[PDB]
Design a binder for these strands. Structure first.
Lengths: 78, 97, 104, 92, 94, 105, 84, 97
DNA sequence: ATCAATATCCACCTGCAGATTCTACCAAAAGTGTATTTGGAAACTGCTCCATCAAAAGGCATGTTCAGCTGAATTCAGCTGAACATGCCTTTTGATGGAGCAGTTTCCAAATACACTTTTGGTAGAATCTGCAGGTGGATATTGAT
DNA sequence: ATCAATATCCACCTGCAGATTCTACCAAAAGTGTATTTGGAAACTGCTCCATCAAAAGGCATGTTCAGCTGAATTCAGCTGAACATGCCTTTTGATGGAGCAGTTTCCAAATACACTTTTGGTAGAATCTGCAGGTGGATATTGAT
């Protein structure tokens, strides 16, 4: 499923970041980084979910998880 | 018989995507990845659509920022092509490593 | 007759007081603290809305969207410093291309 | 159930831009902003009171917190607006 | 006048438990006190927040446990959850 | 008159930790197992650091743990290092580390 | 008392060199020293400013070590060994 | 007359200061610097000795950390000599500026 | 630089339709009044510890010389990654209907908060003990010239 | 492949600064007995959330071709490191007055706690509007080429 994060999508992200030329090895490096990011955020979110005896990850659980990681997000509950 | 020189369309896409705000990863592949990663932490979970949307906005903002710092590292090395060692240097200075 | 009108504020002094008592910040809460804090929240809200209304005008738009909030924040040195670890969903980034990557 | 700051943000919007509206996603961002700054100010004032072994958060704590968080500006003007609202309140 | 509390005696006890031959300079004990107060406040405030997000006015060992899992990484967390759960059931055995 | 630490099987002071929780403005009420659990976690982390630090002290032929030993213990353990990756330990110095490219060819 | 001026230059070239060494730096360009002074000065301004704000809040005239510890903790530079 | 080749004494100093923990800025000059900066912010201040000590330990820990990241930027540029643009790149990625 | 073609990009105007906005009514806060509580400001004052000052001295800072070797040009070729058009497939979209399940609401028993009385564990000094910081010796590398 | 110059160990010696232990009051844990809740354990709604269908409409995967960027190789001016002479100024030891922290009390203005009343903000079916997204048609920007 990590490979479903396609090369052209990584291209688009890079371009929003101002990147002009991309080495061919960037795509797998990017997938590895994205996966560490999601593991860290989701793990904390699901910890909030379990603490609340629910089976549904809330947007609030993600927002609190992101605020713990120092990635505060506006527009979903806080 | 028309071809733009390498670099021209790339600059054109920088100008386009720095101007829009649409998510750049496709929704369904992303949702599969999120649910798969989640399954290793707790089983048979459900996700509010807004929780998936929140994760995608977080991740895409994170990656775009990381590419900015990576690009700066590549420029620092007198290149214009980002490489894995650029991402690695940025992530190290950031304290993620 | 409300405390906000008495303070001359649009923001709700009474609610800011109930959130301070209920938020586990301290045992007691002085009478002016919710007033003061409400004033600061309304002032910062106004500052952002002003700059974002301006971005909206600058784009031939009458309704402020997230992108206008992003351009307002990132283009102001101080709001940007205050919010340098905050992500504004659907706000995008500022147009910026490194000189070295331009043609010729 | 589920109170918000939307009403007050919209009022302030009409004060500075009577001509201008706001999409609900943007109203969401304004809510996140107000809750965030609220918690920063309140948390710093909490600590301030603790370091000085006091049990009351007063406008004195809120002010020092504002000085500690906003660059100044945006802190000089915040201090202005806060002092102003408190005196207008105490003479009524 | 002007009496001030510390964790030093308890740090020193645990020290004798793990390394009976070894001492600790007061500067190193200073570091240890800062560590205990730091981690205490991280755990306590994460617990404060969990309780708030669930409209619960009480911090129970369940909160303290979720906080420890959110703060400590990996292997330190599994051992801390063990020691804490063990102490709580031993304590509730009057 | 048992102490709660004794009942819990702990060296760290359960009663004092229970008092720091009520006075700390963390929540209205504090359950009875919360201070026990928290004193347990604090004592375990103290044990883990002191273990590693004592080993550093012995590795450098010293009998008394000083800050430098605390630094080596923390920086050399991946998890204590992540736990304290934003903490500065006064008089701890740094880990001996020279980038390879800088050694003689 | 006596007028304080140009004390940043008391951060000498050999001291900056030593600090570079503990940081593993082998070769130092001649322009580093004035950069370091600039960077140090910003660091100090930000910490002392917060510390003195804590001092003023307590209606004191003496910056305590606790004031510096709290200022550093605000800046995300938590310091152990003066904390009490 | 005996002469060590350039770089040899530098490596000796890296090894030496990486074993030690003593402060590397002179005490009295630093104390003067803190007093000057503080005084240009509020007058009539006094300082606990330990407050100056805390400032120095923080400051030196900060500068040593910054020089590690700086050194990484120099090496990334296939150099060995740290330069001001290295410190600037480090501080940019760190989010200090 | 200015000939000619291919695409790109930019304005002006257009008409839906997805979201705003404006209008219409009920519990939960918000304001008031009344009666106690109490936190911490004010007024001394005991007593650390901060700012200065004197003085002698040696560890270091400053400046200078000299050349080793580093960084910054310059060149160049192989090959990596950009731009295509071509192809086919997984994402998207939008219901229907089913259901799993957050959120209410009614609980009572376990557990928490009070609140005085009785104990004792810890803190602040004296008192008693001892790692180790330097200081001096010759082993044992380590470097750098031939 | 060997000296020589110099730096680096490493172990052995020893009292002094700093630690470990010894002693007495008091703030603070503990015990016991009361009087509030808390938030769980059940039984039930209505949302929202998967699971599928079933079209098409994109958007991605693939192979071609080469432009141009990265990296390797060579040079060399001059920057920066090492070593040295000189002597300043930081350190260290120690003393002194007094600023200004911090510890006790006293005790009013301002806090929390009710109990009652009255208002507001959130909700869910009201009525328009802002821009999206397509339409041109007109310059613009790129890139090839006498």
């Amino acid at each position: 499923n990590i490979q479903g994060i396609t090369k052209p999508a990584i291209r688009r992200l890079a371009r929003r970041g101002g990147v002009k030329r991309i080495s061919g090895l960037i795509y797998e490096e990017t997938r590895g980084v994205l996966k560490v990011f999601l593991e860290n955020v989701i793990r904390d979110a699901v910890t909030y979910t379990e603490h609340a005896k629910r089976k549904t990850v809330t947007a609030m659980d993600v927002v609190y998880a992101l605020k713990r990681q120092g990635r505060t997000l506006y527009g979903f509950g806080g | 018989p028309h071809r733009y020189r390498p670099g021209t369309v790339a600059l054109r896409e920088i100008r386009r995507y720095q101007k829009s705000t649409e998510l750049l990863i496709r929704k369904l592949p992303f949702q599969r990845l999120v649910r798969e990663i989640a399954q290793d932490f707790k089983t048979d979970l459900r996700f509010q659509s807004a929780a998936i949307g929140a994760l995608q906005e977080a991740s895409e903002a994170y990656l775009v920022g990381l590419f900015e710092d990576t690009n700066l590292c590549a420029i620092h090395a007198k290149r214009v092509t980002i490489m894995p060692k650029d991402i690695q240097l940025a992530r190290r200075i950031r304290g993620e490593r | 007759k409300t405390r906000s009108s008495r303070a001359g504020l649009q923001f709700p002094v009474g609610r800011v007081h109930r959130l301070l008592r209920k938020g586990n910040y301290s045992e007691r809460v002085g009478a002016g603290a919710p007033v003061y804090l409400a004033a600061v929240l309304e002032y910062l809200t106004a500052e952002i809305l002003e700059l974002a209304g301006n971005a909206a005008r600058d784009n031939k738009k009458t309704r402020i969207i997230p992108r206008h909030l992003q351009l307002a924040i990132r283009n102001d040195e101080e709001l940007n410093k205050l919010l340098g670890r905050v992500t504004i969903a659907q706000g995008g980034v500022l147009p910026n291309i490194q000189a070295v990557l331009l043609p010729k | 159930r589920k109170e918000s700051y939307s009403i007050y943000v919209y009022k302030v919007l009409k004060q500075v831009h009577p001509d201008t509206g706001i999409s609900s996603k943007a109203m969401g961002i304004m809510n996140s902003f107000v809750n965030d700054i609220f918690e920063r100010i309140a948390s710093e004032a909490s600590r301030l009171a603790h370091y000085n072994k006091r049990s009351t958060i007063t406008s004195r704590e809120v002010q020092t917190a504002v000085r500690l968080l906003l660059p100044g500006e945006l802190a000089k003007h915040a201090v202005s607006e806060g002092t102003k609202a408190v005196t207008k309140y105490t003479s009524s």
